[PDB]
Amino acid sequence: VPNPTMPVKGAGTTLWVYKGSGDPYANPLSDVDWSRLAKVKDLTPGELTAESYDDSYLDDEDADWTATGQGQKSAGDTSFTLAWMPGEQGQQALLAWFNEGDTRAYKIRFPNGTVDVFRGWVSSIGKAVTAKEVITRTVKVTNVGRPSMAEDRSTVTAATGMTVTPASTSVVKGQSTTLTVAFQPEGVTDKSFRAVSADKTKATVSVSGMTITVNGVAAGKVNIPVVSGNGEFAAVAEITVTAS
Amino acid sequence: VPNPTMPVKGAGTTLWVYKGSGDPYANPLSDVDWSRLAKVKDLTPGELTAESYDDSYLDDEDADWTATGQGQKSAGDTSFTLAWMPGEQGQQALLAWFNEGDTRAYKIRFPNGTVDVFRGWVSSIGKAVTAKEVITRTVKVTNVGRPSMAEDRSTVTAATGMTVTPASTSVVKGQSTTLTVAFQPEGVTDKSFRAVSADKTKATVSVSGMTITVNGVAAGKVNIPVVSGNGEFAAVAEITVTAS
Numbered sequence A, B: 001v002p003n004p005t006m007p008v009k010g011a012g013t014t015l016w017v018y019k020g021s022g023d024p025y026a027n028p029l030s031d032v033d034w035s036r037l038a039k040v041k042d043l044t045p046g047e048l049t050a051e052s053y054d055d056s057y058l059d060d061e062d063a064d065w066t067a068t069g070q071g072q073k074s075a076g077d078t079s080f081t082l083a084w085m086p087g088e089q090g091q092q093a094l095l096a097w098f099n100e101g102d103t104r105a106y107k108i109r110f111p112n113g114t115v116d117v118f119r120g121w122v123s124s125i126g127k128a129v130t131a132k133e134v135i136t137r138t139v140k141v142t143n144v145g146r147p148s149m150a151e152d153r154s155t156v157t158a159a160t161g162m163t164v165t166p167a168s169t170s171v172v173k174g175q176s177t178t179l180t181v182a183f184q185p186e187g188v189t190d191k192s193f194r195a196v197s198a199d200k201t202k203a204t205v206s207v208s209g210m211t212i213t214v215n216g217v218a219a220g221k222v223n224i225p226v227v228s229g230n231g232e233f234a235a236v237a238e239i240t241v242t243a244s
Helices: A092-099 B091-100
Strands: A014-018 A034-036 A040-044 A052-054 A068-070 A078-083 A104-109 A115-128 A136-143 A163-165 A176-182 A204-208 A211-215 A220-228 A233-241 B014-018 B034-036 B040-044 B049-054 B068-074 B077-083 B104-109 B115-130 B133-143 B163-165 B176-182 B193-195 B204-208 B211-215 B220-228 B233-241
Touching (some): A078 A115, A092 A115, A176 A233, B077 B115, B176 B193, B193 B204
Antiparallel strands (some): A014 A034, A040 A078, A078 A136, A115 A136, B014 B034, B014 B104, B040 B077, B049 B068, B163 B176, B176 B211, B193 B220, B204 B211
């Protein structure tokens, strides 16, 4: 249904903030580590500007028409307003973002399956109080550097497939096992994943660079879950830890 | 069309340096043995100046005022800033010209069909570096000897080429006749004139558009004298005005 080659109605646009380490420009589609800014009243995204540079010389033949070229770009100052919920986790993060000069990344997800990623710092934090109307928080972000517009990405293989091949065998104290994940839906992939531990008593899971290691801290039988990105696909494995 | 007798807008002025072995002042118009200095950001021609000489004596009758005469003339220094292109010929030649200290000739070609040619040595080589702005090499050349201005190779024509043909008719009240003047001794002339009546009562005169206009305010025979320049040439017109 989402067609990036056809106009969209604009309803359903969503705002996220990247509260983590790594490259937000790498995999903007995966909502892992992105915190949602819910209840957005309205949003005016930033404008990609460009300054003018004079390229005229005295020796130039004739000067009847001006000659100019592109200069610096300086794309920034995107603003929005959302319902004021001070006690909600995600707005306190916004206030902390304002209270220091941190230049964080934020993304806008459009109903046609496209994402625009910007990086900037909060330059205006305000409010509007009036009766018979929800109190609104107004925010403005000055962007720095080059954004990653939706027109930079054009392939999106959509994946649609993943499985798990675990050891599913015994585990000894002080010895850790490794489980594998197949994320090759016909080769090309554009999605990451994560894994968890059910109890954090019998076993612990370390995830990095597709390497997933289960260590049997305590004996017993535990289940290791895996969730791919936003949660489109999941998997469950079983690991047994022996006392001897 | 270039016109030395009318002001020009200065855009398109070019700078050249002599790489030949002949006489630079011989034929400045031809660009045969000349190298262009392209991408000239701006130019400042050298200013001619002559110091003062005290021409007073003890036995000079009156002293309440100072008596001075023209002293030794100097051609000043011409300073031009042009875009920095170190890999192109013309800037390497300029650097060598500054480096080995010889007195070379250069010329400025205005958008007039004229040219001002100087001789001098480079007394300054500079550079300006700043982001968002082109790197500019700044050069100052101290001029020596006598410069050859564009006024040196101008030509004046005084071949006695004034002819005056009047209306030679009967003009009426409320209507004005015209009188034509030819100033083409082979087509070229730089001398003007002045035309007026003899009594300013029978007819009122007005010169404009290289033409004479006579208004027949009063009937009778009126005389219109015309004198060219400093009284070398003249003409007399007779105009008859009728009652109607």
